């Protein structure tokens, strides 16, 4: 059921008395495929240990996204640090047309029909943070009905 994919692995460096210490970082995403997404970021001296720590962190820290039969409710904007993100609900049989970091988030969240675009910095950690936050603040016709005290005739 849980769909998990590795987004990026980078080699970072810390300087000590006797030279550089190289460590690895792993950025991952986990999801049910029915509106649940979480990202994880792990650090370790070896690549497998880092990908593992990331997956553990990703399994918890999961959020709920109000999907509309494999697509979004409305066009949405996401922002985190240097990454500005835009997502649009597309028609049936179009697929996910997005970059790697956004595509992984949208795949595991279960968003089968998306037109996406990343502006500014394309740093994977802030791109996935901006995407997740964008999907999170996305509201349902039922939520807007509950707020307005009118329901559910938004037509």
């Amino acid at each position: 059921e849980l769909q998990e994919k590795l987004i990026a692995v980078n080699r970072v460096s810390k300087t000590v008395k006797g030279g550089r210490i190289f460590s690895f970082t792993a950025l991952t995403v986990v999801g049910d495929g029915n509106g649940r997404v979480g990202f994880g970021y792990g650090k370790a001296r070896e690549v497998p240990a880092a990908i593992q720590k990331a997956m553990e962190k990703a399994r918890r820290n999961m959020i709920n996204v109000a999907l509309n039969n494999g697509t979004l409710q409305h066009p949405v904007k996401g922002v985190h640090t240097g990454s500005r993100v835009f997502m649009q609900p597309a028609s049936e049989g179009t697929g996910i047309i997005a970059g790697g970091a956004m595509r992984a988030v949208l795949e595991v969240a279960g968003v089968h029909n998306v037109l996406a675009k990343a502006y500014g910095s394309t740093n994977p950690i802030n791109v996935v943070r901006a995407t997740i936050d964008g999907l999170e603040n996305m509201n349902s016709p039922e939520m807007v009905a509950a707020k307005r005290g009118k329901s559910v005739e938004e037509i």
Binding site: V144, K147, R148, K150
Partner: protein
Amino acid sequence: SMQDPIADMLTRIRNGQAANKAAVTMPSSKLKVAIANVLKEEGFIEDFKVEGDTKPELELTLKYFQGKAVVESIQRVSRPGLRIYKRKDELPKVMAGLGIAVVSTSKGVMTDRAARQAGLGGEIICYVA
């Protein structure tokens, strides 16, 4: 200066909502009242009141659902520096229909849906969601 009283009303609402204020008061005008009407009729505010005769003051009772303000976003579209007018077929829909666009038409101030039904166009005052 006080060159845009409409953007001020929206900002008074926006800031009041962010500051968890029960109500917001501002100097009144017919146009501010016409927008206050559309906001109330669409469930974005509780109720509005115009007190005074010589110096009218418009008060709006803000709406809070659960831990949050009802007005998520409220932006000025047409403004003194750049006027935005759209035809019936060019009318914008906020949040793919989940929000409202306040339009000023030949037959008064109404929502995007209302103007579309009435076959009208006009000045796009603001977007509310």
